[PDB]
Design an enzyme around this catalytic site. Sequence first.
Site, PDB file in Angstrom:
ATOM      1  N   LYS A 294       0.933  -1.337  -0.272  1.00 29.54           N
ATOM      2  CA  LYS A 294      -0.156   0.269  -0.120  1.00 29.54           C
ATOM      3  C   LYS A 294       0.709   1.324   0.214  1.00 29.54           C
ATOM      4  O   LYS A 294       0.819   1.966  -0.750  1.00 29.54           O
ATOM      5  CB  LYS A 294      -0.538  -0.213   1.128  1.00 29.54           C
ATOM      6  CG  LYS A 294      -0.283   0.043   2.706  1.00 29.54           C
ATOM      7  CD  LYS A 294      -1.357  -0.175   3.638  1.00 29.54           C
ATOM      8  CE  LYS A 294      -0.917  -0.671   4.992  1.00 29.54           C
ATOM      9  NZ  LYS A 294       0.742  -1.478   4.448  1.00 29.54           N
TER      10      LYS A 294
ATOM     11  N   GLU B  28      -2.075   9.338  12.399  1.00 29.11           N
ATOM     12  CA  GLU B  28      -1.014   7.790  12.982  1.00 29.11           C
ATOM     13  C   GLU B  28      -0.311   7.122  13.368  1.00 29.11           C
ATOM     14  O   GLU B  28      -0.493   7.539  15.469  1.00 29.11           O
ATOM     15  CB  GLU B  28      -0.139   8.748  12.260  1.00 29.11           C
ATOM     16  CG  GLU B  28       1.430   8.523  12.172  1.00 29.11           C
ATOM     17  CD  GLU B  28       1.423   7.313  11.198  1.00 29.11           C
ATOM     18  OE1 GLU B  28       1.798   6.360  11.552  1.00 29.11           O
ATOM     19  OE2 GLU B  28       1.115   7.288  10.176  1.00 29.11           O
ATOM     20  N   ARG B  29      -0.045   5.714  13.629  1.00 26.28           N
ATOM     21  CA  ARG B  29       0.152   4.598  14.038  1.00 26.28           C
ATOM     22  C   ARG B  29       1.448   5.281  14.897  1.00 26.28           C
ATOM     23  O   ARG B  29       2.030   5.041  15.711  1.00 26.28           O
ATOM     24  CB  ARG B  29       0.264   3.601  13.644  1.00 26.28           C
ATOM     25  CG  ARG B  29       0.263   2.281  14.826  1.00 26.28           C
ATOM     26  CD  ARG B  29       0.259   0.831  14.219  1.00 26.28           C
ATOM     27  NE  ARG B  29      -1.032   0.901  13.798  1.00 26.28           N
ATOM     28  CZ  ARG B  29      -1.979  -0.016  12.971  1.00 26.28           C
ATOM     29  NH1 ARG B  29      -0.831  -1.134  12.293  1.00 26.28           N
ATOM     30  NH2 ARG B  29      -2.448  -0.238  11.900  1.00 26.28           N
TER      31      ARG B  29
END
Lengths: 118, 118, 473, 84, 54
Positions: free
Chosen positions: C158, C184-185
Amino acid sequence: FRDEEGQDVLLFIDNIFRFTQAGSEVSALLGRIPSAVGYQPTLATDMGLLQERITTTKKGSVTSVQAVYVPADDLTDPAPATTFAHLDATTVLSRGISELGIYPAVDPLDSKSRLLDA
Amino acid sequence: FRDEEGQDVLLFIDNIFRFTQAGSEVSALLGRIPSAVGYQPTLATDMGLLQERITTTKKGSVTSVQAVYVPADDLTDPAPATTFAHLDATTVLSRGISELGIYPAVDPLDSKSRLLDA
Amino acid sequence: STPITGKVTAVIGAIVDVHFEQSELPAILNALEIKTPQGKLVLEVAQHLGENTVRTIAMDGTEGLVRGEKVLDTGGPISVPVGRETLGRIINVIGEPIDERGPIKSKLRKPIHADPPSFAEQSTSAEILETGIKVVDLLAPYARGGKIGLFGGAGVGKTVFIQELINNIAKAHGGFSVFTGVGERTREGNDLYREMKETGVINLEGESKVALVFGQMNEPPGARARVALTGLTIAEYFRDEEGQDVLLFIDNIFRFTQAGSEVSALLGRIPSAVGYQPTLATDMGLLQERITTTKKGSVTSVQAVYVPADDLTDPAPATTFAHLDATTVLSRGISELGIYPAVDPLDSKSRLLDAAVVGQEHYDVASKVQETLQTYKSLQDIIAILGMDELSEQDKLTVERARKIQRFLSQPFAVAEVFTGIPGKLVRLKDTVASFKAVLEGKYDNIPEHAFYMVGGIEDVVAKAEKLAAEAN
Amino acid sequence: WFRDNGKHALIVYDDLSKQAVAYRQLSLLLRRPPGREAYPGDVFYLHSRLLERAAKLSEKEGSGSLTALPVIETQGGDVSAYIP
Amino acid sequence: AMAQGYAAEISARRNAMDNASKNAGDMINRYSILYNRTRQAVITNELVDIITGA
């Protein structure tokens, strides 16, 4: 009996779900916002207090066998599901094998115990 | 016409569900706690008041061909479920029969009436 | 001038209530500011509660707050530093560089709350935008100013698709994409920043082609609902003042909708359908209407969409479906076994694939390709059972041709140069349609199937066949 | 206007489902009791009052007409949902 | 004759299994739609009930 007498007692409660049901019964009139699917918001803490008052101490032993009624034979209902965390050897009874004729009706698969080990 | 004239009257409506729908419309702004699936609390009482005045009435007689709209083809909706009890001869007109092409689309397995006795 | 000041009255969760004085209340959506030892806690005004009190939502953690602390009104909404200086820097919702590479030297400062371009300014022609990816710009072409929805997953490349799109748009017209990592991680974020530096898209010493704005998942609700607006403001400035065909990447539009529903619950609004905010459609339209093509330039958004419980009927997926144009369903290891792009051409669809837009020949070749692939997929079962014998001569020809097409869908990536070895090629859409129709006509059957694999233009297919022959005999 | 002035008019109500959605948003922002799928009870009344304003007039009025073409997006290919 | 009957019976069984396959697929589609509608309706039910709780 357990503490002062130092005796091994057998606490035989029936339909412990009724206690939480009675708590939810007056929860609304007390002025508390209802929780999911219409139970009291404080069921976990009070029932945990009640269950952890049921334990084997170093002064004596208690053997507790209490039946838990599941509303509409649903095991995902908050009350029985949260009780599951408080019980060592859970013996769940299933309707299906009850109408199949096995009246002991203990589910061979779902009923699990901690004591089962080599 | 039933009392003063002493005639056999033949009352017809087109939809009684609209009455309960309008009651639910006015209930929200009237200031009452909503009932199940957002209906008025005074559903059964008002509907019974409406449908009890329509009766055979010893001095005279009446036939009333009621007509009900089921919301989203739900036979368990509170208004149709409540108006079931105040009718002797019923006709459900299931949709599945309609897409099967059989017109009238009445379901023979749910039509049901009291007069069907030997 | 005299600054507008007030006193904090209550902090309830992220919700902060502030009392102002007479004739001093700002408008809602305005930015407020308090001096905390950690930094700047900023409050976005949501409602006026009367008695000179306003209800605000915190964009940062509200800990150790005391009633009666001083507050200051900025004057307008949250304004993000905007300009070409943003390229290469990590910026947040409040417009503060979290890249610790010095302050942002942007000369302009625009609010994040703006209005979409009026009806007259809207472009009246559906325009095509070259993607560089052959299968993408042939079978599911992107709309210039579209709302492309990436239906991918995990382990499907991705990201590498995203960097390839950024590089292709930077080379093709003017592309200065803006990545908006909503939720956002902060681990994937750090890896993405490192990949930016490695791929050369982000050039610390040189010029960069993308600005990385993202609010991490640990931020309070509302900041995750405003990072998208900040990125959209950046993209709109890059479009309305430079005339470029800017891109915009959303980490997960479902996360934005979840944050929006989360904000409404905190305010006290009744969740409408499925724990969802009553203003779901309104918020979605407000976000997705400013992302559009205008007379000056265009901005195309590529958003990643998560479908709850794999339910296409969920209200948030449908509301996103209202604004998609085209879609790209990256194959979950279906085409990844083999073709590097792995876009699953039989599932990714596009609304613009019509003769009026892409041309009659483009529609013809795309339709023939998709029907050939469908027939080949339908015959795959009996191919697996027996093999190649049970098929008729035309069935065998179609199966072999569709296998060639499937191999030819692949294209080397200019961002995958460091990955294996392969020089990526910016295959033009005209070259793509010409090559695919040439393969369609059936004059290239003697070329082996692997001469289309990891190959761009059709002349590259010919050259690869020649080198295969040379290394054979 | 055209219908009462003796002329005939076509009106297309594209996506009245989003009309119902907007009305639902307005109602729940007004603290109105939710109904089936949280749609307020007057969702039927809205569409009713909206659509019944289009019909052929008799000769004494001027024999005008108004034709309505509503557009409803069924979600899942089902016509058994509340709004449909 | 018995060999021919065996072959014909196996062929008819294959055709019947294909027919049952497509019928089961249609049933799957319809019941997936119904299940999605049911879960959405029920979750709306608990949300509206808890809203009326306030």
